[PDB]
Every structure is written in C-alpha cells, then in structure tokens.
Design an enzyme around this catalytic site. Structure first.
Site, PDB file in Angstrom:
ATOM      1  N   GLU A 128       0.925  -1.208  -0.091  1.00  0.00           N
ATOM      2  CA  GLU A 128       0.015   0.022   0.006  1.00  0.00           C
ATOM      3  C   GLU A 128       0.730   1.393  -0.080  1.00  0.00           C
ATOM      4  O   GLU A 128       0.214   2.289  -0.395  1.00  0.00           O
ATOM      5  CB  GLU A 128      -0.865   0.056   1.217  1.00  0.00           C
ATOM      6  CG  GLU A 128      -1.999  -0.919   1.090  1.00  0.00           C
ATOM      7  CD  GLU A 128      -2.816  -0.807  -0.064  1.00  0.00           C
ATOM      8  OE1 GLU A 128      -3.164   0.094  -0.572  1.00  0.00           O
ATOM      9  OE2 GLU A 128      -3.645  -1.837  -0.109  1.00  0.00           O
TER      10      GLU A 128
ATOM     11  N   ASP B  78      -6.251   6.764  -5.151  1.00  0.00           N
ATOM     12  CA  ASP B  78      -5.836   5.384  -5.188  1.00  0.00           C
ATOM     13  C   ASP B  78      -6.085   5.020  -6.661  1.00  0.00           C
ATOM     14  O   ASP B  78      -6.115   5.601  -7.630  1.00  0.00           O
ATOM     15  CB  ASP B  78      -6.749   4.416  -4.251  1.00  0.00           C
ATOM     16  CG  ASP B  78      -7.987   3.818  -4.653  1.00  0.00           C
ATOM     17  OD1 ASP B  78      -8.612   4.141  -5.655  1.00  0.00           O
ATOM     18  OD2 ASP B  78      -8.413   2.866  -4.129  1.00  0.00           O
TER      19      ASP B  78
ATOM     20  N   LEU C  41      -8.918   3.919   2.824  1.00  0.00           N
ATOM     21  CA  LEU C  41      -9.814   4.651   1.818  1.00  0.00           C
ATOM     22  C   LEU C  41     -10.976   5.540   2.312  1.00  0.00           C
ATOM     23  O   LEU C  41     -11.287   5.304   3.663  1.00  0.00           O
ATOM     24  CB  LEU C  41     -10.887   3.302   0.970  1.00  0.00           C
ATOM     25  CG  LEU C  41     -11.832   4.354   0.449  1.00  0.00           C
ATOM     26  CD1 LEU C  41     -11.333   4.662  -0.927  1.00  0.00           C
ATOM     27  CD2 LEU C  41     -13.161   3.385  -0.043  1.00  0.00           C
TER      28      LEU C  41
ATOM     29  N   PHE D 280      -8.607  -6.880   2.627  1.00  0.00           N
ATOM     30  CA  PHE D 280      -8.005  -5.323   3.169  1.00  0.00           C
ATOM     31  C   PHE D 280      -8.172  -4.440   1.935  1.00  0.00           C
ATOM     32  O   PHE D 280      -8.840  -3.583   1.751  1.00  0.00           O
ATOM     33  CB  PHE D 280      -6.519  -5.265   3.636  1.00  0.00           C
ATOM     34  CG  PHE D 280      -6.136  -3.705   4.193  1.00  0.00           C
ATOM     35  CD1 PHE D 280      -6.136  -3.531   5.332  1.00  0.00           C
ATOM     36  CD2 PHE D 280      -5.746  -2.988   3.056  1.00  0.00           C
ATOM     37  CE1 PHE D 280      -5.733  -2.190   5.826  1.00  0.00           C
ATOM     38  CE2 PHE D 280      -5.069  -1.763   3.543  1.00  0.00           C
ATOM     39  CZ  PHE D 280      -5.080  -1.239   4.826  1.00  0.00           C
TER      40      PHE D 280
ATOM     41  N   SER E  46     -12.385 -19.983  -6.145  1.00  0.00           N
ATOM     42  CA  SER E  46     -11.025 -20.063  -5.908  1.00  0.00           C
ATOM     43  C   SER E  46     -11.120 -20.356  -4.292  1.00  0.00           C
ATOM     44  O   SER E  46     -10.099 -21.108  -3.956  1.00  0.00           O
ATOM     45  CB  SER E  46     -10.458 -18.446  -5.637  1.00  0.00           C
ATOM     46  OG  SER E  46     -10.642 -17.711  -6.736  1.00  0.00           O
TER      47      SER E  46
ATOM     48  N   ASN F 201      -7.021 -19.733 -11.032  1.00  0.00           N
ATOM     49  CA  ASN F 201      -8.106 -19.189 -10.884  1.00  0.00           C
ATOM     50  C   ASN F 201      -8.158 -17.948 -10.453  1.00  0.00           C
ATOM     51  O   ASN F 201      -9.046 -16.919 -10.813  1.00  0.00           O
ATOM     52  CB  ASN F 201      -8.981 -19.892  -9.912  1.00  0.00           C
ATOM     53  CG  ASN F 201     -10.524 -19.684  -9.988  1.00  0.00           C
ATOM     54  OD1 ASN F 201     -11.130 -18.740  -9.255  1.00  0.00           O
ATOM     55  ND2 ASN F 201     -11.152 -20.048 -11.139  1.00  0.00           N
TER      56      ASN F 201
END
Ligand SMILES: [Cl-]
Ligand SMILES: [Cl-]
EC number: 3.2.1.17
Length: 162
Positions: free
Chosen positions: A11, A20, A32, A104, A117, A132
């Site tokens: 990040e 972002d 965010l 996250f 998945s 996948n």
C-alpha cells in the site's frame, strides 16, 4: 514478515490525501476515505476519522493508527463472514495473511466473489487456486500486487515479499 509489513509494502505510505488506483480518495496506508468524487467530502471524512481539523494532512502516527484499526476490521470482518471464516480457519499463517491482504484491499464483498477460488483454497489445491485467482479484474488492474498475493497463497511462503 507479517501482515503489517506485508500490507505496508503493498500500500505504501502517504500523508496527504491521494487517489488510489481506482481514482478514489485515500490517505495513509491505503485507508480509503470515500468513493465520492468530492474532495471536500473526503476532507470531511478525514476529519471525522482522525478526530480533528486536519486540512487533508495527517502525521505518521495518525496513519499508523488508521492502519491498525483497518487491519483489525479486516480480520474481524473475515471471522464474521460465514463463507470466509471456514476457509480462513483451514489455512496456515502465511496464507491467512494473504487473505487478509485481499480483504483489506477490496473489502468483504470484493473477496466474497472469489467463491470458486476459495473452495479450491479450502480443498488445498494451490496451483489451481492460483490460476483461478488470476482470472479476475483484480489481477488485470493491479497485477504486480496480485502476483505477490497469489505467490503467497500458492507457496505458503513470504518469498514474493523478500
Ligand atoms: Cl474510520
Ligand atoms: Cl500493481
């Protein structure tokens, strides 16, 4: 290596509001602020979260404090989710870290659409699951991050981050 250090690499760390990869207003360590196109809206969100008049700028310490709350929320969001919990509980520590990474970055919701998945994950068919996971907007948009997270799940090691 751990979740904190792992996300901190994915990040980055920024002390002013920024956009972002999806064009949304963020600050700190991937926190965010809002999906709206309004900057004011973001700055209000920001002051509300920090508890003071920040003027779009925060300190490292404040960044870190958002980050802690946010890792915690991620975890708990997972534990609270009936579809995810069991997947997460079936895994080892490294792989858990990878799932929290995903949650996250994209929220409980985003992660919940990897049903297939996850079923592979739960069955421990790693190379298949890795394949996948790659068939996803997620991989197509932020491919380098995606690859790191994917290697993590496939290998069960921190190699991609060392
Ligand atoms: Cl908050
Ligand atoms: Cl990327």
């Amino acid at each position: 290596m751990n979740i904190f250090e792992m996300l901190r690499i994915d990040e980055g760390l920024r002390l002013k509001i920024y956009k972002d990869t999806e064009g949304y207003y963020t600050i700190g360590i991937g926190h965010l602020l809002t999906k709206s196109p309004s900057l004011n809206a973001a700055k209000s969100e920001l002051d509300k979260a920090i508890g003071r008049n920040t003027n779009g700028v925060i300190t490292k310490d404040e960044a870190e404090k958002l980050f802690n709350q946010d890792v915690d929320a991620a975890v708990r969001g997972i534990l609270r989710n009936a579809k995810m919990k069991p997947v997460y509980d079936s895994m080892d520590a490294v792989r858990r870290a990878a799932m929290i990474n995903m949650v996250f970055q994209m929220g409980e919701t985003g992660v919940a659409g990897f049903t297939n998945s996850m079923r592979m994950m739960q069955q421990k068919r790693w190379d298949e699951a890795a394949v996948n996971l790659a068939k996803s907007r997620w991989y197509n948009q932020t491919p380098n991050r995606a690859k790191r997270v994917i290697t993590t799940f496939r290998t069960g090691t921190w190699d991609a981050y060392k």
